[PDB]
Design a protein around this motif. Structure first.
Motif, PDB file in Angstrom:
ATOM      1  N   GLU A  83     -57.509 102.300  65.427  1.00 30.46           N
ATOM      2  CA  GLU A  83     -58.284 102.182  66.652  1.00 30.46           C
ATOM      3  C   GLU A  83     -58.504 103.517  67.335  1.00 30.46           C
ATOM      4  O   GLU A  83     -59.580 103.770  67.877  1.00 30.46           O
ATOM      5  CB  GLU A  83     -57.572 101.236  67.605  1.00 30.46           C
ATOM      6  N   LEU A  84     -57.508 104.380  67.305  1.00 30.54           N
ATOM      7  CA  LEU A  84     -57.600 105.664  67.969  1.00 30.54           C
ATOM      8  C   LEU A  84     -58.153 106.815  67.133  1.00 30.54           C
ATOM      9  O   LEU A  84     -58.880 107.654  67.669  1.00 30.54           O
ATOM     10  CB  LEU A  84     -56.212 106.063  68.433  1.00 30.54           C
ATOM     11  N   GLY A  85     -57.788 106.923  65.856  1.00 30.29           N
ATOM     12  CA  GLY A  85     -58.160 108.101  65.086  1.00 30.29           C
ATOM     13  C   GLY A  85     -58.846 107.951  63.733  1.00 30.29           C
ATOM     14  O   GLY A  85     -58.905 108.943  62.998  1.00 30.29           O
ATOM     15  N   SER A  86     -59.439 106.790  63.414  1.00 33.69           N
ATOM     16  CA  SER A  86     -60.055 106.580  62.099  1.00 33.69           C
ATOM     17  C   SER A  86     -61.203 107.526  61.766  1.00 33.69           C
ATOM     18  O   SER A  86     -61.584 107.636  60.605  1.00 33.69           O
ATOM     19  CB  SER A  86     -60.558 105.165  61.984  1.00 33.69           C
ATOM     20  N   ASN A  87     -61.745 108.229  62.742  1.00 34.40           N
ATOM     21  CA  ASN A  87     -62.802 109.174  62.451  1.00 34.40           C
ATOM     22  C   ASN A  87     -62.291 110.324  61.629  1.00 34.40           C
ATOM     23  O   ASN A  87     -63.045 110.912  60.878  1.00 34.40           O
ATOM     24  CB  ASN A  87     -63.416 109.721  63.725  1.00 34.40           C
ATOM     25  N   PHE A  88     -61.028 110.668  61.776  1.00 41.02           N
ATOM     26  CA  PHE A  88     -60.473 111.835  61.117  1.00 41.02           C
ATOM     27  C   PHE A  88     -59.369 111.503  60.134  1.00 41.02           C
ATOM     28  O   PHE A  88     -59.219 112.191  59.121  1.00 41.02           O
ATOM     29  CB  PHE A  88     -59.956 112.792  62.170  1.00 41.02           C
ATOM     30  N   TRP A  89     -58.582 110.482  60.413  1.00 41.88           N
ATOM     31  CA  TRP A  89     -57.467 110.122  59.561  1.00 41.88           C
ATOM     32  C   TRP A  89     -57.722 108.765  58.939  1.00 41.88           C
ATOM     33  O   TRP A  89     -57.550 107.745  59.603  1.00 41.88           O
ATOM     34  CB  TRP A  89     -56.195 110.117  60.386  1.00 41.88           C
ATOM     35  N   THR A  90     -58.100 108.760  57.654  1.00 43.02           N
ATOM     36  CA  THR A  90     -58.437 107.532  56.936  1.00 43.02           C
ATOM     37  C   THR A  90     -57.530 107.211  55.748  1.00 43.02           C
ATOM     38  O   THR A  90     -57.516 106.075  55.273  1.00 43.02           O
ATOM     39  CB  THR A  90     -59.873 107.612  56.424  1.00 43.02           C
ATOM     40  N   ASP A  91     -56.784 108.166  55.244  1.00 41.53           N
ATOM     41  CA  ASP A  91     -55.930 107.980  54.083  1.00 41.53           C
ATOM     42  C   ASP A  91     -54.594 107.417  54.547  1.00 41.53           C
ATOM     43  O   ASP A  91     -53.774 108.162  55.049  1.00 41.53           O
ATOM     44  CB  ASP A  91     -55.773 109.359  53.449  1.00 41.53           C
ATOM     45  N   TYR A  92     -54.313 106.147  54.265  1.00 42.41           N
ATOM     46  CA  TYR A  92     -53.066 105.551  54.737  1.00 42.41           C
ATOM     47  C   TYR A  92     -52.127 105.230  53.588  1.00 42.41           C
ATOM     48  O   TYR A  92     -51.309 104.316  53.686  1.00 42.41           O
ATOM     49  CB  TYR A  92     -53.313 104.309  55.592  1.00 42.41           C
ATOM     50  N   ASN A  93     -52.248 105.973  52.498  1.00 41.76           N
ATOM     51  CA  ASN A  93     -51.390 105.803  51.341  1.00 41.76           C
ATOM     52  C   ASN A  93     -49.987 106.319  51.602  1.00 41.76           C
ATOM     53  O   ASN A  93     -49.754 107.138  52.483  1.00 41.76           O
ATOM     54  CB  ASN A  93     -51.978 106.506  50.153  1.00 41.76           C
TER      55      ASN A  93
END
Lengths: 97, 158, 174, 133, 49, 56, 147, 37, 50
Positions: A33-43
């Motif tokens: 919700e807050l940072g998906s524009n920049f942080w997308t890799d959740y591995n």
């Protein structure tokens, strides 16, 4: 006043601060919700995610101590309740009138 | 202490062959992580003070608390002034400081304890202003603590 | 409940005695007379027994009914109303009676007490959704109450609806 | 912006800048190369709620080099990749000894980056509808 | 009383370990990367530096 | 799943759609997802996306 | 927009450079013809901490203000604005004891309350227009031969 | 005086809730960080 | 600030973690502030036996 057999519950689910998996999912939801524009890799190799899991573990520890019973949390080194409570022998009796 | 050796922030350090730059980066990470540890340490510290906060003999002067963290090998270098790590009371004044509105919070705690005996000190709020000026806040808190200590006889020998 | 420190039936300065006044709830108005609420003998006696055991070897208390007496309001017409019927002066009168009745007997009322200054009464009315203003108001005791014999005391001398007496008064007409 | 399913994340040895208050990030192929460095730098039981993450290459320290060993090394590497790095396919593993005396074993891993998105790849705008297993 | 444990120099455990390796693989096999029995911990922790 | 390719000289949009989906008829949905207006001439450095088909 | 107005209404009158003015407020702020105790009392009773108004009165401010009528309603001449006369006063009590107030403390509270209103009037000067969707440009008529 | 009665029996400062042992919000921990930095 | 970036997707990653952490801690505040009730109940029911 006999000893009882001891066992551990199997439904490890509470949806609160003592539930590791619950906390982890909420963590990730907030991140998107807050940072998906920049942080997308959740591995799992991601340092970001690693830090989250460590913090979730630490939270469970805190919650577990908060639940320690009062008898121990406000105990004195020498025993007794001198500065905490007045006892029935002291606070209930009345002068004779 | 929960991270792997690869990160380089544990007690055994990081092998020399990996170079200075990697050692420096490990220092940067330790700095960052202290923002999370100082907060957690505060909450644990606050549990240790419940006995004082609700004491019938004498309560504390502060309502919020902190701790020095000493299980990190270089804290003497990470902090600009290591002096504070030798005394949690100074550390509290420096890190929390004004955020702790002690006069209002101390009164709320005292009023609760007094209420448990069905008593009431509301009138001190203005009667004392005919005797003292700004100094009444300290005087009134001292009197409320004395009242609780002396209560056993006060309510009985009427 | 009200405790009276030196009160005997013939004195308000007698040492070694006390009078207690009891007011019932009377919520179930289907039975009770809500403008003359009273305590039955059972309760008056049970209360006296209970207390006399806890006082002192030397003191007995008496338990009585309040023997209520009270003044009532009149006022300048409201400057506004929802309608002549919907917010009829009679409806306003009923609301005023309820506000006072709540002191005399259990009922709801926002005001702290019936025995209050006109300022409280004004606020109670101002709060209504069907009102705007009123030029003047007064609430003297009913000197003109024919039924209860004439020469009755009036409450004209700028009192904030003070009770006529320590006992045998209520200041809760309705 | 075609190659957005490889994703973006923190650099492994995270570096903090002061010219702007930010931590450096990696993407695409750079991100993949750092993932491999992490995986083969950690032991199986070192993560807290991930008890099976990392590798066992240390089992082979202080041992002679032969055909049986080389076969075992290859198996260890391939399984670690199949379980933990969804974005690549190994191409070749070359195991050789470059020193008669010094105790050195040299392992060269070559691999290919996938052009299609794996069902195990947790990248935010994709796994929601494509991450079945 | 029984909570207090004995502390020893390492040489006697190494002689034991040498025997195991000689029987399992042979005298030409290195003694390193072998676990010790009856050991709770090293007396001190030695850093990489 | 999702797919990406780079355009080489000699490629056409309906022939590439056939090799990825099995049918040439999806070429107008591939062109809309990439913002192409002149899809009958592709430039030889463009990287395209190929979205998957919807399931329900 | 949050108030529930639409575009036709927001832009109904002259355009104003300093922010929008609400017609309802404007109509309400007309010169007052009558002042009364039933409103003044309600203003005082509604202030948090007030329990009882024990005494209150209105009057035309004048000289030789001796014994006079309650003036439950005061009427104002047709082209005048009413204003407090600055000879006004409120005596504050707790229980039965009178208390004293300090002028500097009151001035500080009054100043803060009103200064915060200026801040909003100023913020209103920037947000004066809606967004319009924007497109691109690309020679929509480009054509290649079918040959 | 009017003595007492049922509606006057509520003690506003007896209920445990009146005391919030910890009251920081997100904005207070952010101020903490600004100083700590 | 907090309102402006709530669910915007626009914060730099080091702040994203810090703020998410602070939000998770709200459940600790909820548990911790129930200690005053537990304390009162203990005294009246287990010490005074009422």
């Amino acid at each position: 006043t006999l000893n009882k057999h001891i066992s551990i519950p199997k439904d490890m689910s509470s949806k609160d601060d003592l539930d590791f998996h619950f906390l982890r999912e909420e963590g990730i939801r907030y991140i998107k919700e807050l940072g998906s524009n920049f942080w997308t890799d959740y591995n799992t190799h991601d340092p970001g995610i690693t830090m989250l899991e460590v913090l979730c573990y630490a939270i469970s520890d805190l919650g577990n101590r908060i639940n320690i019973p009062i008898e121990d949390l406000i105990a004195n080194e020498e025993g007794g309740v001198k500065g905490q409570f007045y006892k029935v022998q002291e606070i209930l009796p009345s002068a004779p009138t | 202490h929960e991270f792997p050796e690869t990160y380089g922030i544990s007690d055994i350090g990081l092998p020399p062959k990996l170079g200075v730059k990697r050692a420096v980066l490990a220092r940067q990470l330790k700095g960052y992580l202290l923002f999370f540890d100082q907060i957690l340490a505060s909450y644990f510290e606050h549990l240790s003070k419940i006995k004082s906060l609700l004491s019938l003999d004498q309560g504390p002067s502060f309502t919020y608390f902190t701790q020095a963290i000493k299980d990190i090998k270089d804290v003497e270098e990470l902090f600009k002034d290591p002096t504070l790590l030798e005394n949690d009371e100074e550390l509290t004044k420096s890190l929390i400081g004004k955020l702790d509105d002690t006069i209002e919070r101390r009164n709320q705690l005292m009023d609760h304890l007094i209420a448990r005996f069905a008593e009431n000190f509301s009138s001190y709020a203005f009667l004392m202003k005919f005797l003292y000026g700004e100094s009444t806040d300290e005087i009134v808190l001292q009197d409320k603590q004395s009242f609780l200590r002396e209560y056993k006889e006060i309510s009985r020998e009427r | 409940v009200k405790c009276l420190n030196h009160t005997c039936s013939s004195s308000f300065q007698s040492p070694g005695n006390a009078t207690l006044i009891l007011v019932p709830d009377t919520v179930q108005q289907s039975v009770f007379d809500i403008y003359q609420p009273r305590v039955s003998q059972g309760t008056l006696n049970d209360v006296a027994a209970f207390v006399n055991e806890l006082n002192s070897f030397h003191v007995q208390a008496k338990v009585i009914n309040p023997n209520y007496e009270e003044v009532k309001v009149d006022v300048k017409v409201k400057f506004r109303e929802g309608l002549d019927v919907s917010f009829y002066l009679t409806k306003v009168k009923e609301d005023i009676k309820k506000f006072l009745s709540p002191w005399a007997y259990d009922q709801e009322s926002s005001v702290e007490f019936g025995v209050t200054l006109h300022r409280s009464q004004m606020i109670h009315y101002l709060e209504q959704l069907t009102y705007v203003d009123y030029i003047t108001d007064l609430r003297l005791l009913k000197r003109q109450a024919g039924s209860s014999p004439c020469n009755p005391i009036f409450i004209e001398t700028t009192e904030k609806e003070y009770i006529q007496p320590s006992n045998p008064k209520s200041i809760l007409v309705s | 912006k075609s190659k957005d399913f490889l994703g973006t994340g923190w650099g492994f040895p995270p570096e903090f800048e002061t010219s702007i208050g930010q931590v450096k990030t990696t993407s695409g192929v750079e991100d993949i190369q750092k993932s491999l460095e992490i995986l083969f730098s950690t032991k199986i039981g070192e993560r807290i709620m991930q008890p099976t993450y990392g590798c066992n290459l240390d089992e082979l320290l202080f041992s002679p080099i032969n055909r049986t060993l080389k076969t075992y090394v290859i198996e260890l590497i391939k399984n670690a990749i199949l379980y933990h790095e969804p974005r690549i396919d190994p191409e070749k593993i070359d195991i050789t000894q470059g020193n008669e005396i010094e105790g050195e074993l040299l392992i060269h891993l070559q691999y290919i980056v996938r052009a299609t998105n794996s069902r195990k790849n947790m990248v935010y705008p994709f796994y929601l509808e494509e991450g079945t297993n | 009383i029984n909570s207090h444990k004995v502390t020893l120099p390492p040489s006697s455990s190494m002689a034991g370990a040498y025997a195991r390796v000689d029987n399992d693989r042979g005298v030409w096999k290195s003694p390193a990367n072998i676990g010790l029995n009856y050991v709770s911990k090293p007396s001190v922790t030695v850093s990489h530096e | 799943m999702s797919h990406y390719r780079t355009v080489k000289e000699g490629d056409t949009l309906p022939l590439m759609t056939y090799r990825i989906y099995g049918d040439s008829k999806y070429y107008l949905e591939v062109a809309k997802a990439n913002g192409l207006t002149n899809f009958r001439r592709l430039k030889t450095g463009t990287e395209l996306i190929f979205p998957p088909l919807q399931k329900q | 927009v949050d108030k529930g107005y639409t575009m036709d209404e927001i832009f109904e009158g002259p355009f104003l450079e300093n922010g929008f003015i609400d017609t309802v407020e404007l109509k309400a702020s007309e010169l007052r013809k009558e002042v009364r105790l039933s409103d003044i009392i309600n203003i005082i009773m509604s202030i948090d901490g007030v329990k009882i108004v024990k005494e209150i009165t209105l009057g035309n401010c004048d000289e030789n203000d001796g014994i006079e009528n309650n003036q439950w309603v005061i009427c104002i001449p047709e082209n005048k604005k009413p204003k407090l006369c600055k000879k006004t006063t409120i005596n504050y009590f707790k229980g039965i004891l009178p208390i004293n107030l300090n002028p500097v403390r009151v001035d500080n509270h009054k100043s803060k309350i009103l200064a915060s209103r200026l801040e909003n009037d100023l913020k209103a000067k920037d947000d004066l227009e809606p967004a319009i969707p924007q497109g691109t440009f690309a020679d929509w008529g480009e054509y290649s031969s079918i040959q | 005086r009017d003595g007492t009665g049922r509606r006057d029996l509520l003690d506003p400062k007896l209920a445990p809730e009146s005391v919030q042992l910890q009251d920081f919000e997100l904005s207070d921990w952010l101020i903490f960080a600004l100083n700590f930095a | 600030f907090l309102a402006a970036y709530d669910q915007s997707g626009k914060l730099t990653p080091h702040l994203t973690l810090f703020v998410s952490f602070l939000k998770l801690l709200e459940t600790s505040k909820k548990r911790f502030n129930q200690l005053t009730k537990r304390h009162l109940d203990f005294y009246y029911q287990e010490i005074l036996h009422l």
